[PDB]
Paper text:
FlgA possesses a typical signal sequence at its N-terminus, recognized by the Sec-dependent pathway, suggesting that FlgA functions as a P-ring assembly chaperone in the periplasm. P-ring formation is a key step enabling the bacterial flagellum to pass through the outer membrane. FlgA can be divided into three domains, denominated as D1 (residues 1–74), D2 (residues 75–142), and D3 (residues 143–198).
To gain insight into the regulatory mechanism of P-ring assembly by FlgA, two different atomic structures of FlgA from S. enterica, the open and closed forms were solved. Atomic models were built from amino acid residues Q1 through L198 (numbering corresponds to the mature protein) for the open and closed forms and refined at resolutions of 1.95 Å and 2.3 Å, respectively. The conformation of FlgA is different in the two forms. This occurs largely because of a bend of about 70° around the Cα atom of R136. By studying the 3D structures of FlgA, we identified a pair of residues, R113 and S190, which are within a suitable distance for cross-linking with a disulfide bond that keeps the structure of FlgA in the closed conformation. To understand how the conformational difference between the open and closed forms of FlgA is related to its function, a disulfide bond was engineered by replacing these residues with cysteines (R113C and S190C, respectively). These results indicate that the closed form of FlgA can bind to FlgI, but cannot proceed with subsequent steps, thereby inhibiting FlgI from forming the P-ring. The closed form of FlgA is reminiscent of the PapD structure, an immunoglobulin-like periplasmic chaperone for P pilus biogenesis.
Author numbering: 1 to 198
The structure:
Amino acid sequence: QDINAQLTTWFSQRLAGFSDEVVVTLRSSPNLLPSCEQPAFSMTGSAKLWGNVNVVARCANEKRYLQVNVQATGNYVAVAAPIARGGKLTPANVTLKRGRLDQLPPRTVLDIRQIQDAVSLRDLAPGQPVQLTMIRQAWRVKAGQRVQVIANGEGFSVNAEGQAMNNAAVAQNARVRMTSGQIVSGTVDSDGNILINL
């Protein structure tokens, strides 16, 4: 049962800020588990946060692939009052509701800061989870603008300047041409700054 406890803790920590209740269950055979007592878990795979995922369990040069099931409960953005097509999304129209993140439809908005100055693409009814496929977010960053790039690491932080190379909404990927001429890539935050996680 200790392996589930490790995964539950590893995922709870990874899902900090998103979920307040995480439960993880191993699907692959425990015989295929690596020799170490505490394997190092790495998500060197696609960007899927929860559900049924593949976790790399490293055991000092010994590599293993574990199939796991991640259940997550937290906040997401839901429609609170009917929104007309072309209608703006506001705090009076949408609200945060608590539910199972793993059960939500794809590309569901979790943070209210994402839908600043956003318009509906279709008719929306109360209770419906806000999906990115059903809205048009305003650009937080515009191509050609100078932006601040903030890179954080373990005991290591970098602040630098560049020019945005593409239009991007809050929480979307932004490519930035640094003064040195180099291209970097990060996530647009609410403040319009570019965050790079190293």
